[PDB]
Tab-separated table of C-alpha atoms (C1' of nucleotides) in Angstrom:
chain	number	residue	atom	x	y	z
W	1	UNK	CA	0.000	0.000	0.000
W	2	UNK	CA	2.286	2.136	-1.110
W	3	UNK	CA	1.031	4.848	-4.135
W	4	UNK	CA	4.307	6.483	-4.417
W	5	UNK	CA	3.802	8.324	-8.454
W	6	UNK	CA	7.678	7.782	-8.540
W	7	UNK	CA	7.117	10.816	-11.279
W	8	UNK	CA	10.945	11.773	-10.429
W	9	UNK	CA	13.238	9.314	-12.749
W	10	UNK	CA	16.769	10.153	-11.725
W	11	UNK	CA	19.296	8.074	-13.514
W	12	UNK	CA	20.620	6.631	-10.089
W	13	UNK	CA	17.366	4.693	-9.063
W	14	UNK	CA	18.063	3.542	-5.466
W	15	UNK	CA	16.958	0.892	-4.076
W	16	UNK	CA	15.529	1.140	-0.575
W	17	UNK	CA	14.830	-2.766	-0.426
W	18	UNK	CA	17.527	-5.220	0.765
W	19	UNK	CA	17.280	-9.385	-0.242
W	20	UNK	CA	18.080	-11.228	2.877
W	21	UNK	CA	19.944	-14.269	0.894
W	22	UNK	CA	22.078	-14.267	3.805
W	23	UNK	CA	22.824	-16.615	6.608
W	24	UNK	CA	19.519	-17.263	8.223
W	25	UNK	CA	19.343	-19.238	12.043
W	26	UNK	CA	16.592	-19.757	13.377
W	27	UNK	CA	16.640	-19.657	17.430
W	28	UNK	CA	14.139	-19.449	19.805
W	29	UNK	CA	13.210	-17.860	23.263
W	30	UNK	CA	10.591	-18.658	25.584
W	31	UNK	CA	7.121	-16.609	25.225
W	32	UNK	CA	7.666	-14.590	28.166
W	33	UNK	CA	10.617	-13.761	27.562
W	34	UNK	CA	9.495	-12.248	23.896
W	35	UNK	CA	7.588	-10.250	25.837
W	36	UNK	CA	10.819	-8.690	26.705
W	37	UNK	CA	12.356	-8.338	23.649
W	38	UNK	CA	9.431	-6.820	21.143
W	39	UNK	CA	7.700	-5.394	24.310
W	40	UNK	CA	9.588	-2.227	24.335
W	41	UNK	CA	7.274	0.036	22.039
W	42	UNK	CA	7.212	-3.130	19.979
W	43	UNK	CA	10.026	-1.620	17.787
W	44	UNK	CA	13.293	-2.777	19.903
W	45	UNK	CA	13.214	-6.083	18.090
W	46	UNK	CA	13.020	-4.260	14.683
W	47	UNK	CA	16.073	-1.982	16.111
W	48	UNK	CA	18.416	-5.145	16.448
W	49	UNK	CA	17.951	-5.146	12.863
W	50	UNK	CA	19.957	-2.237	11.993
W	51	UNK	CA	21.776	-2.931	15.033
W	52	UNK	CA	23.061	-6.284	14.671
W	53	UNK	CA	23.032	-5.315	10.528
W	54	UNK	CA	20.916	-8.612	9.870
W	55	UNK	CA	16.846	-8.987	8.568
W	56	UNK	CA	15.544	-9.571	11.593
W	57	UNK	CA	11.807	-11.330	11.715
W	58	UNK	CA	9.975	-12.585	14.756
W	59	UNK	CA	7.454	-15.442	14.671
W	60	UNK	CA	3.634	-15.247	15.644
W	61	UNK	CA	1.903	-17.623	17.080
W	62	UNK	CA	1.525	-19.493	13.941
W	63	UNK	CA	3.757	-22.634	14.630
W	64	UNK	CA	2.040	-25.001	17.371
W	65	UNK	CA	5.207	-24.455	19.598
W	66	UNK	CA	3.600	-21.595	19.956
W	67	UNK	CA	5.101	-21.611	23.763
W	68	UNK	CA	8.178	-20.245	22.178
W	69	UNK	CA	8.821	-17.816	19.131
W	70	UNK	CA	11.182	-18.396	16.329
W	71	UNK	CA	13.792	-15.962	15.651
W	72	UNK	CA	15.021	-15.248	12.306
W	73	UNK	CA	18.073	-13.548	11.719
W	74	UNK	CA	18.941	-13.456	8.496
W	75	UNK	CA	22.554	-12.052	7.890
W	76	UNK	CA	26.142	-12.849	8.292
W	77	UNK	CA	28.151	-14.025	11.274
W	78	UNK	CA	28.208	-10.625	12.075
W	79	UNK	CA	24.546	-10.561	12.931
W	80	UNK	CA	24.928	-13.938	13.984
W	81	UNK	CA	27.621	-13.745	16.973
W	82	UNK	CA	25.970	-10.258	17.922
W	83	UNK	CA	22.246	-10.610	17.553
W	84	UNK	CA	22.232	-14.293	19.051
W	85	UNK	CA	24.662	-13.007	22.011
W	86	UNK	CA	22.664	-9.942	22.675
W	87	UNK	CA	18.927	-11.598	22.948
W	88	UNK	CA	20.818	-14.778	25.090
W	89	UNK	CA	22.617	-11.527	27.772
W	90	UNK	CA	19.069	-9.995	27.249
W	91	UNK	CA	17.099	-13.144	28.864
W	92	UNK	CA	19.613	-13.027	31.912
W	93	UNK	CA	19.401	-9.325	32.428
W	94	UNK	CA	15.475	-9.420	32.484
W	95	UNK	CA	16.024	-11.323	35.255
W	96	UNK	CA	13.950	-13.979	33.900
W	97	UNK	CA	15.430	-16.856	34.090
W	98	UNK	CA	18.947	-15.489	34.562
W	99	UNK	CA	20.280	-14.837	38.323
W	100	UNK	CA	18.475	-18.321	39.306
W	101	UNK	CA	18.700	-20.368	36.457
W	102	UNK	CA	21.404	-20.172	33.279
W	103	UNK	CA	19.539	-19.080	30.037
W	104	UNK	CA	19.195	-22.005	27.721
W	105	UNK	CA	18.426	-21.254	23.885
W	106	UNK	CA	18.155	-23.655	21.168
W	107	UNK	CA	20.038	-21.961	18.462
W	108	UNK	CA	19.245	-23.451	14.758
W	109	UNK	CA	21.888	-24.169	12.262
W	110	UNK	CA	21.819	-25.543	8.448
W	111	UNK	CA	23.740	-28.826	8.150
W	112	UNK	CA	23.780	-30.629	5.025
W	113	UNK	CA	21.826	-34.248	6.015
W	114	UNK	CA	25.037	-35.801	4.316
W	115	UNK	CA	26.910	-34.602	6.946
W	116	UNK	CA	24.638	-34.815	10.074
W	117	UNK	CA	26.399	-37.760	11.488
W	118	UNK	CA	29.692	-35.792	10.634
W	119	UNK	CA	29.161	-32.188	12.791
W	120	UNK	CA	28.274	-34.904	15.916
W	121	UNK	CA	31.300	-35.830	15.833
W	122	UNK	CA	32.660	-39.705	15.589
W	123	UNK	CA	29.690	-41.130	17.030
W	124	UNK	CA	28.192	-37.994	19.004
W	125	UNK	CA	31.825	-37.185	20.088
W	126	UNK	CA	31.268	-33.232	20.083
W	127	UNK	CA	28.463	-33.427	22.425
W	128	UNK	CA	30.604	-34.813	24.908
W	129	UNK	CA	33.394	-32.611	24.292
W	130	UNK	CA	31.740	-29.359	23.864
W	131	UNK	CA	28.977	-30.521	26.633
W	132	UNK	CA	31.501	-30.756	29.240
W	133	UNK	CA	34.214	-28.669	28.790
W	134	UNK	CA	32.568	-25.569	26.867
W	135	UNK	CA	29.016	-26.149	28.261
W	136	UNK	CA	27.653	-27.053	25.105
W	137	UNK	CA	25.118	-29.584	23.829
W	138	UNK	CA	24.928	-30.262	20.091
W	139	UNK	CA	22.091	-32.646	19.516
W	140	UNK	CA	21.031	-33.559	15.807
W	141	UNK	CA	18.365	-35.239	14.308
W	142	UNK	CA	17.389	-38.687	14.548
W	143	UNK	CA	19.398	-40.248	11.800
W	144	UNK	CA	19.104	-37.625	10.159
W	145	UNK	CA	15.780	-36.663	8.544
W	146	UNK	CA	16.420	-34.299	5.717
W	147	UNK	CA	14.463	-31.905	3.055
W	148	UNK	CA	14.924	-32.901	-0.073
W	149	UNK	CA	17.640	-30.117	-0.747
W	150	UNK	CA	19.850	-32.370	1.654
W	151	UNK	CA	19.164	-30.351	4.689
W	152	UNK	CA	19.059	-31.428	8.312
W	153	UNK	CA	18.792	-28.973	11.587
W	154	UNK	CA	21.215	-29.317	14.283
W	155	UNK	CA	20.578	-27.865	17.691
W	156	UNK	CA	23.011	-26.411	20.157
W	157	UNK	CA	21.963	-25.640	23.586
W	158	UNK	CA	24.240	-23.783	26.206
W	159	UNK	CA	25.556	-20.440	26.673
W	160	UNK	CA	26.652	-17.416	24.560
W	161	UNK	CA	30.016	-18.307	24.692
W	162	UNK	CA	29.478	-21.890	24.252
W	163	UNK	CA	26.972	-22.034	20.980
W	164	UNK	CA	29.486	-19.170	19.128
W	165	UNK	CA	32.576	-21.390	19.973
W	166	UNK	CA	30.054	-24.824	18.803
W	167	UNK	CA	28.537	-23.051	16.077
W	168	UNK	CA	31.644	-22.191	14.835
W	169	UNK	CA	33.591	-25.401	14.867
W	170	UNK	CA	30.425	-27.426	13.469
W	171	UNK	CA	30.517	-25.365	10.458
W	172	UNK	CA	34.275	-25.485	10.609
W	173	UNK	CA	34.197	-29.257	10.278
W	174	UNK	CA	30.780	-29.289	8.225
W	175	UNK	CA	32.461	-27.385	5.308
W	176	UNK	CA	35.532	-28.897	5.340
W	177	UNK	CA	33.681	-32.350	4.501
W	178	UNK	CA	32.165	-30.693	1.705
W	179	UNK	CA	35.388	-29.949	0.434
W	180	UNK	CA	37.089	-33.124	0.763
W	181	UNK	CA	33.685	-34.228	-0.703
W	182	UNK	CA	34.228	-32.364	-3.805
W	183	UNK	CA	37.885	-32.127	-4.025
W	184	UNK	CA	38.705	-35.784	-3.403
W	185	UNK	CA	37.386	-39.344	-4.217
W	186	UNK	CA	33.317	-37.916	-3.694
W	187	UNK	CA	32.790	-40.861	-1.219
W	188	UNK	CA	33.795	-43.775	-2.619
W	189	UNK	CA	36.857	-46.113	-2.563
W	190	UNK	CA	37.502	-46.999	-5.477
W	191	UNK	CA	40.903	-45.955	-5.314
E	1	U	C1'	40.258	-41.613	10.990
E	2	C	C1'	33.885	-40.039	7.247
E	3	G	C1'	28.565	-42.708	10.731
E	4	G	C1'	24.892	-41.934	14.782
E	5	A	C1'	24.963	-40.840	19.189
E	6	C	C1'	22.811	-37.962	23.250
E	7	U	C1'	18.225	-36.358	24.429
RNA sequence: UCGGACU
Protein backbone atom coordinates (compact mmCIF):
# COMPACT_ATOMS: atom_id res chain seq x y z
CA UNK A 1 0.00 0.00 0.00
CA UNK A 2 2.29 2.14 -1.11
CA UNK A 3 1.03 4.85 -4.14
CA UNK A 4 4.31 6.48 -4.42
CA UNK A 5 3.80 8.32 -8.45
CA UNK A 6 7.68 7.78 -8.54
CA UNK A 7 7.12 10.82 -11.28
CA UNK A 8 10.94 11.77 -10.43
CA UNK A 9 13.24 9.31 -12.75
CA UNK A 10 16.77 10.15 -11.73
CA UNK A 11 19.30 8.07 -13.51
CA UNK A 12 20.62 6.63 -10.09
CA UNK A 13 17.37 4.69 -9.06
CA UNK A 14 18.06 3.54 -5.47
CA UNK A 15 16.96 0.89 -4.08
CA UNK A 16 15.53 1.14 -0.58
CA UNK A 17 14.83 -2.77 -0.43
CA UNK A 18 17.53 -5.22 0.76
CA UNK A 19 17.28 -9.39 -0.24
CA UNK A 20 18.08 -11.23 2.88
CA UNK A 21 19.94 -14.27 0.89
CA UNK A 22 22.08 -14.27 3.81
CA UNK A 23 22.82 -16.61 6.61
CA UNK A 24 19.52 -17.26 8.22
CA UNK A 25 19.34 -19.24 12.04
CA UNK A 26 16.59 -19.76 13.38
CA UNK A 27 16.64 -19.66 17.43
CA UNK A 28 14.14 -19.45 19.81
CA UNK A 29 13.21 -17.86 23.26
CA UNK A 30 10.59 -18.66 25.58
CA UNK A 31 7.12 -16.61 25.22
CA UNK A 32 7.67 -14.59 28.17
CA UNK A 33 10.62 -13.76 27.56
CA UNK A 34 9.49 -12.25 23.90
CA UNK A 35 7.59 -10.25 25.84
CA UNK A 36 10.82 -8.69 26.70
CA UNK A 37 12.36 -8.34 23.65
CA UNK A 38 9.43 -6.82 21.14
CA UNK A 39 7.70 -5.39 24.31
CA UNK A 40 9.59 -2.23 24.33
CA UNK A 41 7.27 0.04 22.04
CA UNK A 42 7.21 -3.13 19.98
CA UNK A 43 10.03 -1.62 17.79
CA UNK A 44 13.29 -2.78 19.90
CA UNK A 45 13.21 -6.08 18.09
CA UNK A 46 13.02 -4.26 14.68
CA UNK A 47 16.07 -1.98 16.11
CA UNK A 48 18.42 -5.14 16.45
CA UNK A 49 17.95 -5.15 12.86
CA UNK A 50 19.96 -2.24 11.99
CA UNK A 51 21.78 -2.93 15.03
CA UNK A 52 23.06 -6.28 14.67
CA UNK A 53 23.03 -5.31 10.53
CA UNK A 54 20.92 -8.61 9.87
CA UNK A 55 16.85 -8.99 8.57
CA UNK A 56 15.54 -9.57 11.59
CA UNK A 57 11.81 -11.33 11.71
CA UNK A 58 9.97 -12.58 14.76
CA UNK A 59 7.45 -15.44 14.67
CA UNK A 60 3.63 -15.25 15.64
CA UNK A 61 1.90 -17.62 17.08
CA UNK A 62 1.52 -19.49 13.94
CA UNK A 63 3.76 -22.63 14.63
CA UNK A 64 2.04 -25.00 17.37
CA UNK A 65 5.21 -24.46 19.60
CA UNK A 66 3.60 -21.59 19.96
CA UNK A 67 5.10 -21.61 23.76
CA UNK A 68 8.18 -20.25 22.18
CA UNK A 69 8.82 -17.82 19.13
CA UNK A 70 11.18 -18.40 16.33
CA UNK A 71 13.79 -15.96 15.65
CA UNK A 72 15.02 -15.25 12.31
CA UNK A 73 18.07 -13.55 11.72
CA UNK A 74 18.94 -13.46 8.50
CA UNK A 75 22.55 -12.05 7.89
CA UNK A 76 26.14 -12.85 8.29
CA UNK A 77 28.15 -14.03 11.27
CA UNK A 78 28.21 -10.62 12.07
CA UNK A 79 24.55 -10.56 12.93
CA UNK A 80 24.93 -13.94 13.98
CA UNK A 81 27.62 -13.74 16.97
CA UNK A 82 25.97 -10.26 17.92
CA UNK A 83 22.25 -10.61 17.55
CA UNK A 84 22.23 -14.29 19.05
CA UNK A 85 24.66 -13.01 22.01
CA UNK A 86 22.66 -9.94 22.68
CA UNK A 87 18.93 -11.60 22.95
CA UNK A 88 20.82 -14.78 25.09
CA UNK A 89 22.62 -11.53 27.77
CA UNK A 90 19.07 -9.99 27.25
CA UNK A 91 17.10 -13.14 28.86
CA UNK A 92 19.61 -13.03 31.91
CA UNK A 93 19.40 -9.32 32.43
CA UNK A 94 15.48 -9.42 32.48
CA UNK A 95 16.02 -11.32 35.25
CA UNK A 96 13.95 -13.98 33.90
CA UNK A 97 15.43 -16.86 34.09
CA UNK A 98 18.95 -15.49 34.56
CA UNK A 99 20.28 -14.84 38.32
CA UNK A 100 18.47 -18.32 39.31
CA UNK A 101 18.70 -20.37 36.46
CA UNK A 102 21.40 -20.17 33.28
CA UNK A 103 19.54 -19.08 30.04
CA UNK A 104 19.19 -22.01 27.72
CA UNK A 105 18.43 -21.25 23.88
CA UNK A 106 18.15 -23.66 21.17
CA UNK A 107 20.04 -21.96 18.46
CA UNK A 108 19.25 -23.45 14.76
CA UNK A 109 21.89 -24.17 12.26
CA UNK A 110 21.82 -25.54 8.45
CA UNK A 111 23.74 -28.83 8.15
CA UNK A 112 23.78 -30.63 5.02
CA UNK A 113 21.83 -34.25 6.01
CA UNK A 114 25.04 -35.80 4.32
CA UNK A 115 26.91 -34.60 6.95
CA UNK A 116 24.64 -34.81 10.07
CA UNK A 117 26.40 -37.76 11.49
CA UNK A 118 29.69 -35.79 10.63
CA UNK A 119 29.16 -32.19 12.79
CA UNK A 120 28.27 -34.90 15.92
CA UNK A 121 31.30 -35.83 15.83
CA UNK A 122 32.66 -39.71 15.59
CA UNK A 123 29.69 -41.13 17.03
CA UNK A 124 28.19 -37.99 19.00
CA UNK A 125 31.83 -37.18 20.09
CA UNK A 126 31.27 -33.23 20.08
CA UNK A 127 28.46 -33.43 22.42
CA UNK A 128 30.60 -34.81 24.91
CA UNK A 129 33.39 -32.61 24.29
CA UNK A 130 31.74 -29.36 23.86
CA UNK A 131 28.98 -30.52 26.63
CA UNK A 132 31.50 -30.76 29.24
CA UNK A 133 34.21 -28.67 28.79
CA UNK A 134 32.57 -25.57 26.87
CA UNK A 135 29.02 -26.15 28.26
CA UNK A 136 27.65 -27.05 25.10
CA UNK A 137 25.12 -29.58 23.83
CA UNK A 138 24.93 -30.26 20.09
CA UNK A 139 22.09 -32.65 19.52
CA UNK A 140 21.03 -33.56 15.81
CA UNK A 141 18.36 -35.24 14.31
CA UNK A 142 17.39 -38.69 14.55
CA UNK A 143 19.40 -40.25 11.80
CA UNK A 144 19.10 -37.62 10.16
CA UNK A 145 15.78 -36.66 8.54
CA UNK A 146 16.42 -34.30 5.72
CA UNK A 147 14.46 -31.90 3.06
CA UNK A 148 14.92 -32.90 -0.07
CA UNK A 149 17.64 -30.12 -0.75
CA UNK A 150 19.85 -32.37 1.65
CA UNK A 151 19.16 -30.35 4.69
CA UNK A 152 19.06 -31.43 8.31
CA UNK A 153 18.79 -28.97 11.59
CA UNK A 154 21.22 -29.32 14.28
CA UNK A 155 20.58 -27.86 17.69
CA UNK A 156 23.01 -26.41 20.16
CA UNK A 157 21.96 -25.64 23.59
CA UNK A 158 24.24 -23.78 26.21
CA UNK A 159 25.56 -20.44 26.67
CA UNK A 160 26.65 -17.42 24.56
CA UNK A 161 30.02 -18.31 24.69
CA UNK A 162 29.48 -21.89 24.25
CA UNK A 163 26.97 -22.03 20.98
CA UNK A 164 29.49 -19.17 19.13
CA UNK A 165 32.58 -21.39 19.97
CA UNK A 166 30.05 -24.82 18.80
CA UNK A 167 28.54 -23.05 16.08
CA UNK A 168 31.64 -22.19 14.84
CA UNK A 169 33.59 -25.40 14.87
CA UNK A 170 30.43 -27.43 13.47
CA UNK A 171 30.52 -25.37 10.46
CA UNK A 172 34.28 -25.48 10.61
CA UNK A 173 34.20 -29.26 10.28
CA UNK A 174 30.78 -29.29 8.22
CA UNK A 175 32.46 -27.39 5.31
CA UNK A 176 35.53 -28.90 5.34
CA UNK A 177 33.68 -32.35 4.50
CA UNK A 178 32.17 -30.69 1.71
CA UNK A 179 35.39 -29.95 0.43
CA UNK A 180 37.09 -33.12 0.76
CA UNK A 181 33.68 -34.23 -0.70
CA UNK A 182 34.23 -32.36 -3.81
CA UNK A 183 37.89 -32.13 -4.02
CA UNK A 184 38.70 -35.78 -3.40
CA UNK A 185 37.39 -39.34 -4.22
CA UNK A 186 33.32 -37.92 -3.69
CA UNK A 187 32.79 -40.86 -1.22
CA UNK A 188 33.79 -43.78 -2.62
CA UNK A 189 36.86 -46.11 -2.56
CA UNK A 190 37.50 -47.00 -5.48
CA UNK A 191 40.90 -45.96 -5.31
C1' U B 1 40.26 -41.61 10.99
C1' C B 2 33.88 -40.04 7.25
C1' G B 3 28.57 -42.71 10.73
C1' G B 4 24.89 -41.93 14.78
C1' A B 5 24.96 -40.84 19.19
C1' C B 6 22.81 -37.96 23.25
C1' U B 7 18.23 -36.36 24.43
Amino acid sequence: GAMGPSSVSGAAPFSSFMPPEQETVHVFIPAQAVGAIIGDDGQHIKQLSRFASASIKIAPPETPDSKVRMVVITGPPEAQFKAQGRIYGKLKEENFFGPKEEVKLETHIRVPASAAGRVIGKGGKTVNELQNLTAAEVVVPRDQTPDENEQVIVKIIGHFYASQMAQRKIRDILAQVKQQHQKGQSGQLQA
